[PDB]
Design a protein around this motif. Structure first.
Motif, PDB file in Angstrom:
ATOM      1  N   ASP A 191       0.826  -1.210   0.000  1.00  0.00           N
ATOM      2  CA  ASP A 191       0.000   0.000   0.000  1.00  0.00           C
ATOM      3  C   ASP A 191       0.873   1.279   0.000  1.00  0.00           C
ATOM      4  N   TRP A 217     -11.559  -4.217  -7.787  1.00  0.00           N
ATOM      5  CA  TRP A 217     -11.022  -2.955  -7.301  1.00  0.00           C
ATOM      6  C   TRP A 217     -10.336  -2.163  -8.426  1.00  0.00           C
ATOM      7  N   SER A 218      -9.577  -2.832  -9.298  1.00  0.00           N
ATOM      8  CA  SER A 218      -9.012  -2.229 -10.503  1.00  0.00           C
ATOM      9  C   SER A 218     -10.103  -1.806 -11.505  1.00  0.00           C
ATOM     10  N   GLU A 239     -12.197   1.890  -9.536  1.00  0.00           N
ATOM     11  CA  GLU A 239     -11.431   3.084  -9.142  1.00  0.00           C
ATOM     12  C   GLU A 239     -10.979   3.070  -7.675  1.00  0.00           C
ATOM     13  N   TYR A 240     -10.576   1.903  -7.164  1.00  0.00           N
ATOM     14  CA  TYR A 240      -9.887   1.806  -5.875  1.00  0.00           C
ATOM     15  C   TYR A 240      -8.384   2.100  -6.007  1.00  0.00           C
ATOM     16  N   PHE A 241      -7.797   1.916  -7.197  1.00  0.00           N
ATOM     17  CA  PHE A 241      -6.356   1.883  -7.424  1.00  0.00           C
ATOM     18  C   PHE A 241      -5.983   2.740  -8.643  1.00  0.00           C
TER      19      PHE A 241
END
Length: 78
Positions: A24, A41-42, A45-47
């Motif tokens: 992280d 998640w990709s 819009e988490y990353f």
């Protein structure tokens, strides 16, 4: 725990088992997570694009880009 590996194992891209670690931006290693989770998640819009990921007990430096893991294990015809 119970780490090992005698040699060149097979490895596979599991969307099912929690097999993929990430570091992280606090600097901490989290997880592991499944490719379904890391994918979603990709896809949510988490990353950001500059997000590498490695398997449980690999080197942090054999970490490949998550956005290529998504192409490596993913749908054909494309």
């Amino acid at each position: 725990g119970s780490s090992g590996s005698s040699g060149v194992r097979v490895l596979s891209y599991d969307k099912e088992k929690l097999n993929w670690l990430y570091k992280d931006p606090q600097g901490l290693v989290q997880g592991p997570f499944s490719l379904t989770q890391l994918k979603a998640w990709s896809d949510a819009e988490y990353f950001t694009k500059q997000f590498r990921v490695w398997m449980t007990g690999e080197s942090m430096e054999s970490a490949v880009l998550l956005t290529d893991v998504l192409r490596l294990s993913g749908p054909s015809s494309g």
